[PDB]
Design a protein around this ligand. Structure first.
Ligand SMILES: [Cl-]
Ligand SMILES: [Cl-]
Lengths: 255, 254, 253, 250
């Protein structure tokens, strides 16, 4: 099942969409400058692009780390990003009451992994009618994502993206099960599946050569998109796009 | 470090405290009846007791599932439990705004495992000044528990209980690492450590008893369970736990 | 099901039996000196005792690190241990050909974990008629131990001990599932289960882990020393024995 | 580091080599038939090929289960495979004494995963001088493969292939860590790394393909496995492999 996001078609058999930006919104000037780098590299490679940032990050490394500019100013910034670049945007929400005003502006709203089971947030997200990105908890098996999907369906919204971020592997480590993508496709109605390579790695060419190997491996399984929590970018995306074009150009095996 | 909860002393070298009750509050009558059974059994065995229940089930499989009586009616029920039995009580919170009104009534407030990294909830819980029970996420190693502890300390509250509930083991399965208790004691200032045997089993009453015994053998402040154990096996179960706990606590550490 | 090993009764409802000694046999004088320490401590606490060592360590940190004295000398050392102390002994075998000559001397022979699925070794061990200790591979779930058991039974030997040594937990790391004991008891005919706390561990940690395991009601404890330091042995065993006495004195629920 | 196996160059920056055949040798006729299928498909796609089989099933469901033809007859069969098809072959060894006679015939000898820490087997394998395929135990981290490699080097043999076969993931289940390939390359001198996709998988055709593709996307020397299913599968692997090998490393 494909999902239309303005002029973008997101789907497991469509060219991959890149989801990328900054961690937290600080200022309009800072945001536009970063977004302009992503936009210029992606436009030049012809890769569809969705800008990501948090306006209010509830899951911070420290208590007093900056949460972001907040709902009101954040949504202003996002409006400016959409107007200047003509691209869709994505942001996370952690409180039910935030969902509706965020959804007036943000094309995709994101369910953080740690809140993925919180029924009230699921419901309030669903009721926006917006495209939703469901982050897979590291403790949830791929065959149980269908239960989160079910709850969104009960609450009236089927425009759902499934985002892999790795699975708990002993202590501390995360491993990404390359079979999980296929399990999610088979059990969740072939909804678009995207890969958050960055998180998948935070606990493991340095990080750069690893991110590339892991992104390649995941995209080889035929996925709707790639999600980075962030010329260097350009070399990376050239390789991802090469693999993605090859894979998507071949028909799926046939019974 | 010991923590005082009314007349109870909770600590890794003190007699074990039982945190027990029901999953979700449904009615006043049901709750008082169950609580009376726990109270009568624990008082006769001489085991300190804290009554546990949730006023809300925040992650049901269905949006249409029964979720509990809710904050307002739930706190009423907890006030009645405290007035009738004179015991401390414990319940979980899911939203920052709930922390203060819950803490006015509930002696111990609990950070659910899924929310343990919701920084705003941590901060709002800490500011209550109440005793807090931190449920260890199944994806968090015992040597990183100190990071949650740090955050509570930075926000001004050192009255923290660490609650083991098992660790992710492949898909859909939990294992309890009996070495984790010691790692938590060593790295988190010997704060009280308690064992949630019930949730620790959930992926799998002979097994609860074996697992509870194993955990208490490592010398713990408390045991945390639901009744899930059938309610009339409770007295026989606790007789065995208390026997082991008395033996272990009577031997000096080294 | 209990198993008789000379005058010892080994069984999940019997006082725990200590299986203890050294990693690899390196000399006669030093083996006897270590064994004497075990024997004096265990006799003083009234704990039944089986001396353990390998004559040939197959998985060494380096290729030329010493394998041990070897089969011929190793069996002579074990005969000396049995003559001097009158206690049973246990050792591992790696090759089918070694089974017979080892079993003539040793009261228990041990199937190493890495070889536990080698059908020829299983068959040759079984055919000795000896008591066998089956080391649980770290990659094998407790509900699959029954398949090793089955193969021993097909080959004619039901005098089997099951030995827990932990399970792979992510990379390079072991966790002991305290529910695995019960699963093995339930699926393998309540054969004696013992706990190798030493190999499970990679201390105050050894003691905690040993206590936790023995709290689940087991036939025995399996450990090494030099690994626990040899003079803390008595203090360690006093605590194990206290817990084991308490647990075994209560009827099963 | 590349390894020459007759006319084949095996190496992490070379076209992938398929290691394929049957589980256990049963008879000359059914072995030749299966081998001929692999040979005809690989030749027609232009993929280098090494035939694999065991002469002995070391872990059998029953003591009475069929075990395979055994060393003597098994080596006869391998000689006939080499003579008829002119390809290298690979088989596993379980006992030190078997190493030399197996190595006389078999181009590559394989160290099974369960025996990978059996030092006497390591030493006897090493002393053959043959190309060795080291099966990575499901309980061993990728950063520890270097310790096995070190032992083979101390015993005088650097012609080693590292073979990924998945890692224990809870009970009774495997997962393949796609970062492990790179860790092994970086810590073990860039020795050839291959991927046993078949054993890594504790319908099923779609899974093997996804997993094989994911692994070969990390740039590997080879792939190891057991209406036209093989060819349709290898067509896709070879497409990916050609793309990945044509891009320079960064
Ligand atoms: Cl998560
Ligand atoms: Cl004997």
């Amino acid at each position: 099942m494909d999902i239309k996001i303005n002029d973008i078609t997101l789907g497991n058999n469509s060219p991959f969409v890149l989801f990328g930006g900054i961690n937290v919104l600080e200022s309009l000037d800072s945001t536009l400058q970063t977004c302009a780098h992503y936009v210029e590299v992606t436009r030049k490679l012809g890769i569809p692009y969705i800008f990501k940032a948090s306006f209010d990050k509830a899951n911070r490394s420290s208590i007093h780390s900056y949460r972001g500019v907040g709902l009101e100013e954040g949504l202003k910034i996002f409006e400016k990003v959409k107007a200047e670049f003509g691209i869709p945007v994505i942001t996370d929400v952690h409180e039910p009451h935030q969902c509706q005003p965020v959804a007036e502006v943000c094309d995709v709203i994101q369910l953080p992994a740690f809140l993925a089971r919180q029924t009230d947030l699921v419901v309030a997200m669903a009721k926006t009618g917006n495209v939703v990105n469901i982050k897979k908890p590291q403790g949830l098996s791929p065959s149980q994502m269908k239960n989160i999907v079910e709850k969104f369906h009960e609450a009236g919204n089927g425009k759902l993206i499934l985002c892999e971020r790795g699975s708990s592997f002993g202590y501390d480590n995360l491993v990404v099960d390359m079979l999980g993508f296929g399990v999610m496709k088979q059990t969740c109605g072939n909804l678009p599946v995207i890969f958050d390579v960055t998180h998948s790695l935070q606990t493991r060419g340095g990080r750069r050569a690893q991110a590339l190997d892991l992104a390649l491996a995941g995209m080889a399984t035929r996925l709707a998109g790639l999600f980075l929590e962030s010329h260097l970018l350009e070399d990376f995306l050239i390789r991802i796009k090469a693999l993605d074009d090859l894979i998507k150009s071949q028909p799926i095996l046939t019974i």
